[PDB]
Design a protein around this ligand. Structure first.
Ligand SMILES: [Mn+2]
Ligand SMILES: [Mn+2]
Length: 508
């Protein structure tokens, strides 16, 4: 069994400047030899090249969606942007139905979402559109519960978004910031239900640090070294000390996040009839008209404003269709991208698809353990390779992206070095097995963890990703995009490529 393996170095891109570039500064003997000894090229992993507005950096969802699809996958951010531009956003029946509910049953409208213009999980401009729409629809009571970013934008940038929002609220004549919480608590994706609960109880019970001014809340957090991303779920209160607003029975909630992985958990806490992860308290809110901007999961008992469209014949499906055995492997942090997103937004496994989940280290931030679980993932898979069970393999090494998000150079360099070591073991095992490896990445991050002034850079970059096909004797085209990865794999697998896959094999 000569396996063909697609190895994704999450957040590993190619950038010339070496300043703050942990990818370049790291000692990657393994990666370097393969780059030198095997055919390679770079791919566009951002902007229109992956279904995003021009300029928009890529990410795991977008990245894994496009890699697994073998075509340019139209993204949510773009789609909604167009809706707002074409005046279709204001005609959305789900939004209107939610607005009618609060008006008809005299309740309140609550707006959930990442407060920033990162564009990865949301865009603050989408929130303003809802605020403008709520004002147009005559919705009296509108409350904003913002989740502070600092991961897709500057580490301490919330003040400007809060400011801009406050200005929009005044202009539009509706809205009131009710709570502010770091996305660390309100947008967890590791089933750390303790974090989630914290966000929940601030929102529905008004429990947590209380302030009368959104900005003083932020000022105070920064004062304690707690920045945007990690801001404790706080509650804004009125002159009478009472919370500005708490989610109650029959209230409506519009969660303006369009990325699912970090939205499902809190969405379940709110809509799940029977919920066990933790005790929501006996007086917890019921009968909430819950609206998801896009589809999060079948579990979320709520409506979807922008309904999804099937992604047919993604590599997972073509491999399965041809009786091949495939394995998806990754540690917690990237398990959803190597499975859900890779499979074209599909939850259920394909027949013949196996999955291995390795638990990420039990650390708050991964700068505290740069090697994360890279070693456990390598050992588990090395075993799978010795067994000779799989035809295709999809491995994702989260380290570069996860610790690069810390905005720290040394830890990110350590991370990159840890993965290189692992990468050599994996590819060397593949080759020894007579198989071929496609070493690549979904987008950049670790190529820039410091700003020009030397400050922490906690977000992705727009740099191209590397592409190595460990198959001597071949050449790779150059104007490639992620959507060209799947066709190349099928090419290597010698399987026919579906018409759906509009991408082109990188092999000449
Ligand atoms: Mn990624
Ligand atoms: Mn990332």
């Amino acid at each position: 069994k000569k396996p063909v393996a697609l190895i994704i170095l999450d957040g590993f891109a190619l950038r010339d400047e070496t300043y703050g570039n942990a990818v370049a500064q790291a000692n990657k003997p393994n990666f370097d030899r393969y780059w030198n000894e095997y055919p390679h090229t770079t791919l566009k992993a951002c902007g229109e090249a992956v279904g995003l507005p021009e300029g928009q950096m890529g990410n795991s969802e977008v990245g894994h969606l496009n890699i697994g699809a073998g075509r340019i996958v139209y993204q949510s951010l773009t789609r909604i942007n167009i809706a707002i531009r074409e005046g279709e956003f204001d005609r959305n029946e789900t939004f209107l139905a939610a607005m009618n509910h609060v008006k008809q049953h005299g309740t309140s409208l609550h707006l959930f979402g990442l407060l920033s213009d990162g564009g990865v999980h949301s865009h603050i401009h989408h929130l303003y559109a809802l605020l403008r729409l709520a004002a147009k629809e005559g919705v009296k009571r509108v409350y904003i519960h913002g989740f502070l970013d600092g991961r897709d934008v500057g580490p301490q940038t919330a003040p400007q978004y809060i400011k801009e929002l406050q200005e929009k609220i005044k202009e539009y004549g509706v809205g009131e910031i009710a709570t502010l919480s770091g996305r660390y608590y309100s947008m967890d994706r590791d089933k750390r239900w303790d974090r989630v609960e914290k966000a929940y109880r601030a929102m529905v019970y008004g429990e947590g640090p209380t302030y009368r001014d959104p900005l003083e809340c932020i000022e105070d957090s920064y004062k304690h070294g707690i920045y945007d991303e990690f801001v404790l779920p706080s509650v804004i209160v009125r002159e009478d000390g009472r919370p500005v607003a708490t989610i109650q029975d029959n209230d409506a909630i519009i969660f303006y996040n369009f990325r699912p992985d970090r939205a499902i958990q809190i969405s379940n806490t709110f809509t799940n009839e029977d919920f066990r992860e933790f005790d929501r308290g006996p007086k917890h809110p019921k009968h909430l008209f819950f609206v998801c901007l896009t589809h999060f999961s079948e579990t979320v008992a709520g409506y979807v404003a922008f309904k999804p469209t099937n992604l047919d014949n993604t590599i997972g499906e073509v491999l399965s269709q041809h009786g091949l055995r495939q394995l998806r492997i990754a540690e917690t942090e990237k398990y959803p991208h190597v499975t859900f997103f890779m499979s074209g937004g599909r939850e259920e496994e394909f027949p013949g698809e196996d999955r291995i989940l390795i638990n990420s280290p039990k650390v708050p931030t991964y700068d505290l353990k740069p090697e994360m679980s890279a070693y456990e993932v390598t050992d588990a898979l090395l075993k799978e390779i010795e067994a000779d069970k799989y035809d295709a393999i999809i491995l994702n090494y989260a380290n570069p992206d996860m610790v690069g998000h810390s905005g720290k150079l040394e830890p990110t360099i350590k991370a990159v070095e840890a993965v290189d070591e692992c990468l050599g073991k994996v590819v060397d095992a593949i080759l020894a097995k007579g198989g071929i490896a496609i070493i690549t990445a979904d987008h950049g991050n670790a190529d820039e963890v410091l700003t020009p002034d030397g400050k922490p850079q906690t977000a992705h970059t727009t740099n191209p990703v590397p592409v190595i096909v460990t198959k001597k004797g071949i050449k790779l085209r150059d104007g490639g995009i992620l959507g060209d990865l799947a066709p190349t794999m099928l090419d290597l697998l010698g399987l026919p490529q579906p018409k759906e896959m509009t991408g082109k094999s990188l092999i000449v």
